[PDB]
């Protein structure tokens, strides 16, 4: 360990805070019960329907919000899905991006009340150039846009265990940015806390950028205040296709992912029998509880090492997520939220539900269609062809009726024409060499094609 930090303090690019924040991973990381793992109550885990709504009095409305900060996490690439730049400026529904549909929420909250909610983008050295010349188009907007970048960490050469910049890596490539966890320790570092608590901010509410169904909500938010909550993740029922679950151990709720699971054990991790709830990553933290356990340097997530190898070489990217900190706060808790709390949009099978008629945008938020009689949305499956935003798009003349589908699966080089209505189970499998097209209007119910002899 000495060696080491003689090493990183040789990166005279490293903030001092960003070293030792590092230094603190490495330790722990080289250094460090199934039978005591317990089911959390409902006074742990509160089922959303079991929480007080707001009064119908807009002041007390208004005083809810006057104590929030919306962030979004915003440290990753458009690169999954064939973009360049960050993903929440990739366009979702209407030619809107998920950062301008964002704005326009938080917007109309403050319209409305009277408030002046700001929204934060935590950013990394990946994303943050973009994003900042990106954020100015909302400078007349009806909110208060702050932008931060999280820390830059060495990535870490796996074998020798050394800074990949001490061997002379000190391009992009040589660093990486800590995981979602590290937005405790930089909401602190970069001022930003500082600033909102200045504001008389008390809770921020953090979720990933991509997250459509992430909006503020005004009854989690009311019992975090009422109920003196520090810490609050918005947890989900798992289903099959599901995730870190939150369990009570040792007293205390807690995150737990299959990282930490004994072999023996891992199949009954994967019971959504066992395990009946999974972290959405919607968590609502207490903005003077981070400042106390980031200065009390009391915040020791488990270490994810996130293995890569990146021209050539192969590294390790010590990480936290910030699901993972709920056990050093107090009276955390989980909310059991309904699934419309979680829609991420991870591939362009993800654009399809989005932009289809399963959906509508409402003033900024994308609202499901009432129409579907399922409350679960269909799966999607497009083969390599659809993977980039552009050749996703150019595949679909519009996006199909799906409002009656139970299931897609799409295989090699085909092509949608428009006014299509999809319905059941529906497979679509062009062979080797071959180019498929759905002509327009074509109606297609429970049926494989699987070339052109099946239409
Ligand atoms: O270091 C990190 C990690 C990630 N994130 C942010 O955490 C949230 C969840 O991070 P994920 O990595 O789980 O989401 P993703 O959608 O980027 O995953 P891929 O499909 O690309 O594998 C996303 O909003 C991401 O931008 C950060 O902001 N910083």
Redo the contacts with the bound molecule.
């Keep these: 360990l000495p060696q080491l930090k003689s090493a990183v303090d040789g990166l005279t690019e490293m903030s001092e805070s960003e070293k030792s924040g590092f230094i603190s991973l490495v330790s722990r990381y080289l250094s460090g019960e199934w039978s005591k793992i317990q089911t959390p109550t409902d006074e742990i885990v509160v089922p959303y329907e079991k929480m007080t709504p707001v009064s119908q009095d807009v002041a007390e409305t208004k005083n809810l919000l006057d104590k929030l900060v919306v962030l979004k996490?915003?440290?990753?690439l458009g690169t999954?899905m064939g973009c360049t730049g960050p993903?929440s400026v990739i366009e979702v529904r209407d030619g809107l991006t998920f950062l301008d549909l964002i704005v326009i929420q938080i917007e109309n909250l403050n319209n409305k009340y009277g408030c002046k909610v700001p929204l934060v983008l935590?950013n990394?050295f990946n994303t943050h150039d973009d994003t900042h010349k990106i954020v100015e188009k909302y400078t007349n907007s009806n909110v208060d846009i702050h932008t931060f970048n999280?820390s830059k960490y060495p990535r870490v050469v796996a074998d020798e265990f050394v800074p990949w910049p001490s061997k002379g890596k000190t391009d992009k490539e040589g660093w990486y940015?800590?995981?979602?966890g590290?937005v405790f320790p930089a909401l602190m570092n970069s001022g930003k806390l500082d600033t909102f608590l200045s504001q008389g901010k008390e809770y921020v509410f953090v979720a990933?950028?991509?997250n459509l169904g992430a909006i503020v909500d005004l009854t989690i938010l009311k019992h975090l205040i009422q109920n003196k909550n520090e810490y609050c993740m918005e947890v989900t029922p798992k289903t099959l296709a599901d995730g870190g679950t939150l369990i009570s151990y040792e007293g205390k709720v807690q995150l737990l992912e299959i990282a930490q699971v004994p072999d023996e054990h891992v199949n009954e991790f994967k019971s959504i029998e066992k395990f009946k709830i999974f972290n959405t990553?919607n968590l609502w933290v207490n903005l003077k509880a981070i400042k106390k356990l980031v200065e009390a340097d009391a915040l020791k997530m488990e270490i994810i090492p996130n293995p890569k190898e990146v021209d050539g070489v192969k590294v390790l990217q010590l990480?936290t997520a910030a699901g993972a900190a709920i056990r050093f706060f107090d009276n955390a808790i989980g909310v059991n939220v309904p699934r419309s709390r979680f829609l991420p949009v991870?591939a362009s099978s993800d654009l399809l539900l989005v932009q289809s008629d399963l959906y509508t945008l409402v003033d900024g938020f994308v609202t499901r269609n009432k129409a579907r009689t399922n409350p679960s949305n269909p799966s999607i499956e497009l083969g390599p062809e659809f993977k980039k935003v552009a050749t996703f798009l150019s595949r679909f003349k519009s996006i199909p009726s799906i409002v009656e589908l139970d299931s897609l699966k799409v295989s090699g080089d085909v092509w949608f024409g428009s006014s299509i209505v999809l319905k059941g189970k529906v497979t679509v499998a062009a062979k080797s060499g071959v180019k498929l097209e759905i002509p327009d209007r074509a109606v297609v119910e429970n049926k494989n094609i699987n070339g052109p002899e099946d239409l």
Excluded: I
Aim: proline content about 10%; overall charge negative; cysteine-free.
């Design positions: 996490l915003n440290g990753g999954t993903k935590m990394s999280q940015p800590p995981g979602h590290d990933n950028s991509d990553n990480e991870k």
